[PDB]
Amino acid sequence: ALRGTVTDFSGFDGRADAEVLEKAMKGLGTDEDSILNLLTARSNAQRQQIAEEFKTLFGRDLVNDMKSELTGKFEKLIVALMKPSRLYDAYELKHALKGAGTDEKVLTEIIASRTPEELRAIKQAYEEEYGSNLEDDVVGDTSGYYQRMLVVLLQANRDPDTAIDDAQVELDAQALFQAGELKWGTDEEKFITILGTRSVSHLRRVFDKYMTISGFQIEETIDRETSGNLENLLLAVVKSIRSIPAYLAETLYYAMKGAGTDDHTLIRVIVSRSEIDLFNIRKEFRKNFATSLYSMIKGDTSGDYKKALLLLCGGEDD
């Protein structure tokens, strides 16, 4: 299996669903319920058919109009809900790099989080859409071993998943053992090289062997051994490896946790995974935090914003 939460319509009519729109934003005010009930109700390919049928009919661009009547959160939510699938990520990514600064967590997230197949297909979109080389921008903004780890990930050449070579698992585990724990300092290049290049089906075994031998979790060593963004990045990598759904759920669980709430991430993940594996991510919530995501979300958000996320999300019982 491998599930998502948003799917295509049983019997879709874009020309109709389009008219529910001018009716929704017409005159003064706005029916912020009709729209959130119709977009979260439609897949993404569909959202786009709708988007054209709108233009074809009223000679208008829907995102432009929507952006003119929705504000702040929902608005951020509906925009990021209409962004084409294939480009959404590069979009997020592109957003992350600007400024003499940059938003690493976002970078760490998607790159560490996305498969080679994904990363590859991303690098293209980004290029065709922003006229620059993804990798080039990254390095333009990142640094140190953080940078290189990312760059290595960008290469989307993680070894394939074949049969298991215990020797290599033993060889690699040991390797990682001598690199940090048994080294007065660290051999960052070694983690980057094993962590970013080995087939997942492999690394997971290394992870267990590493437990046996040192008596620590590869993550633990990372904490003790490393620091800085380099840390968070190896963490996500290691985590995504074990289970992306998992890594991700933990991402959400932190964006709501404690005082306030992190929307950019809440939306991002929520949206981005909706049609891919959001159902799964949800399963790594009931189990890993004793609470279903639905509730968490429901208690941290409000208004239409909340209403929508809870429709995208779903799963109350769980």
Ligand SMILES: [Ca+2]
């Ligand atoms: Ca209006």
Ligand SMILES: [Ca+2]
């Ligand atoms: Ca050490």
